[PDB]
Chains A and B, each alone.
Chain A
Amino acid sequence: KAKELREKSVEELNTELLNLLREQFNLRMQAASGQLQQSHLLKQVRRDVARVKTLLNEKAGA
């Protein structure tokens, strides 16, 4: 992504960050119970959060 997220406002990025953290917690409880087969998604969700936070920093400081 990182271009469709760069076209979003600060509250949109905050809402997307909250949704990504919720999906990360849900996938963590899913994988913790031995129930996750698609184990890649955690990694993707993790990097997704990073992208949002990086964009938040470059929307906050400059």
Chain B
Amino acid sequence: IREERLLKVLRAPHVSEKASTAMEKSNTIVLKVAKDATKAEIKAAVQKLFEVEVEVVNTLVVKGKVKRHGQRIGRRSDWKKAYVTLKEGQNL
């Protein structure tokens, strides 16, 4: 896998109460990733850019909402959430 592809995948950390709870239960980091990222690219990117080990990645596609800004109708962009399961022997 080409490394400069891995440098473009992981867009943003995603924090919420569900991500808090998922970190407490099954120590999963929740990432905003690129729209076209597959699970192998995300696993290799977290294993390289964060120097940790990943067990498994579960990716879902969030569809953007439709908003009314000043009686003009727009639609927010879709994005991809990724639940990344850090390994049990890795402790933080």
Interface residues of A (CB under 8 A from B): 17-18, 21-22, 24-25, 28-29, 32-33
Contact = CB atoms under 8 A, between A and B. Distances in A.
Contacts, number: 23
B61 interface: no
Interface SS of A by simple majority = helix
B10 A25 contact: yes
Interface string B1-26: 00110011011110000000000000
Contact of B13 (A17, A22, A32): A32
A9 to B, nearest CB: 19
B20 to A, nearest CB: 15
B13 A33 contact: yes
Given A32-B12, A33-B13, A25 B32 contact: no
A56 B8 CA distance: 19
Contact of B3 (A18, A32, A33): A18
